Amino acid sequence: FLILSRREGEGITLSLKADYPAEELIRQLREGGIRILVTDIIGNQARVGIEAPRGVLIVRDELK
Amino acid sequence: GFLILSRREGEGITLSLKADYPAEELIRQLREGGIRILVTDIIGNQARVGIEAPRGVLIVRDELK
C-alpha cells in the first residue's frame, strides 16, 4: 500500500515501469488487481492508499 | 472523459482488467495512456473520485463483490 494526500483537483498517475517484463505484469493483475482505498478524508485533504504490483509506477501528478 | 464515484473513509475501489480483453493489447493501452486518478471534489464525509482508464480495465466500487 502507498499513501498520499490529495486535495480537491489534484491527481495521481499510474504509468507502468518501463523495465519490467510485459507478460509478467498481466498475471499479477488478473490475480492481484489494483486497490484504491480512501483511507481517511479530513477537511480539504483526502488521503488515498494505492496497492499495485511492483511494475506499476505511482506518482503524484506534480512529479512531472 | 473519466468515471466518477463517491467514496467515504474506509471505502475503496478495485481495478480489474476484463477477463476477455487480450493480454498483449492491454499493455498497449497503458503504455500510451496510463491510468489517471483525480479527486474531483471533496465534500464533508464523501470523496469524489475520477478514474480514467482503457476499456481493458474494470472499475468497481469494493462493495459490489
Next chain:
RNA sequence: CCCCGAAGGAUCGGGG
C-alpha cells in the same frame, strides 16, 4: 479544523 512537507510502495512525516 488550518500549515508545511512527502521519488513515498508505508494505512507517510512535521508544525500550530
Next chain:
RNA sequence: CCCCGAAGGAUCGGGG
C-alpha cells in the same frame, strides 16, 4: 453542510 442512491467509463443521479 447532511440523507440515499449509483454495473457507472459520465468531473453520476435523487431529497432536504
